[PDB]
Amino acid sequence: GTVNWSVEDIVKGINSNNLESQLQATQAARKLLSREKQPPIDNIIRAGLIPKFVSFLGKTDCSPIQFESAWALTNIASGTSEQTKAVVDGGAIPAFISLLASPHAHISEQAVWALGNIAGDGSAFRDLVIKHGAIDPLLALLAVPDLSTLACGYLRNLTWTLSNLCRNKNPAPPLDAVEQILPTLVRLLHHNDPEVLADSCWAISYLTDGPNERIEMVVKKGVVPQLVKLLGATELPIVTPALRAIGNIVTGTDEQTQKVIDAGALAVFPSLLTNPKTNIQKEATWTMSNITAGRQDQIQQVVNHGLVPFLVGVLSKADFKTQKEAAWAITNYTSGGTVEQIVYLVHCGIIEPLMNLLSAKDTKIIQVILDAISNIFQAAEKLGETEKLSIMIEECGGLDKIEALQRHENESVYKASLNLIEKYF
């Protein structure tokens, strides 16, 4: 019927002045474009079929040709930036926004999907989709008392499209657009579907990545308890964006960081810092470094949740990227922590795994470790226990490692290493 057609056959059928012949050639195009291996996107573009598909989107008296062009165009917009640009250049943005008002759920849905692919390309197409007024009709589709009345697949597509309108950074989405989307997005973050939750979390992770004003916008909507609750999910596709969003929030103000702690996020970190997935471990340790960079009372809540032995362990054995975040977490801890807090760190066995990381061929981690050691020696100076820590560093072969760093390429490494040896050894 409409299977294994050539581009020239589709061109013949679409160039006819027969709607049904156009409908069959459009179905044949969609099928060609749906295929898994090397669909001929560029061939369909070069043939000049995109304006033809876009014009078929307006054919209200033929709902199947609306669906088929919509699907065809969606798959062209899912390709490269030049391929998404072609769909936009064909004038498909206003055409797809009008389609959101279709009385046919499958056409309405295809429009939502295509707008998601266009917005997902980057900031410029994201903002162009917003300028053409996509947000109002998309949010009107979710204006129901209970989200559970909408079809699963339909709700998943809307949430994913909305997350792409929250995505990309130079620039970030317009503040007005973010403010209009946020109430629906919070409502989706409480919906009982795992894919809806994951995509809702991604959207929140995108909105919290940037200035503190943007973190504040999100935090004021009271999403932090829900993000902590999702941070404990058994589904990795939910934990990954949840931890991202929590990670972002703690890059902001101490007050914003505190909201995360108050919601009980640190209770989840014993598992997070031992998670089998490297990215979760790395992101959890990074989230930890920005918490230890906080107030002394925040460092105290880390101690209280027994998280210092968990940092000792990641420092001892983890992926080098996670171990790099762990060094940062210790340097931040020792920078703003009390003498009692720093003494507790040495007692938990921080010196040995900290010294073993001085063998690394990364200058930045060496710099971070040497600053942490300096901060630990300052706490030892205040108690008159400098010799105790000096022998402690000599016993685990720490001193030798600093001895070799005196003859290093980096100046900041060369200075700090030579300074510790003349001041304490």
């Binding site: 998601g116 390309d121 991604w202």
Partner: peptide, 7 residues
């Protein structure tokens, strides 16, 4: 994440 094609 990124773009999604149908079927």
């Amino acid at each position: 994440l990124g773009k999604r094609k149908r079927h």
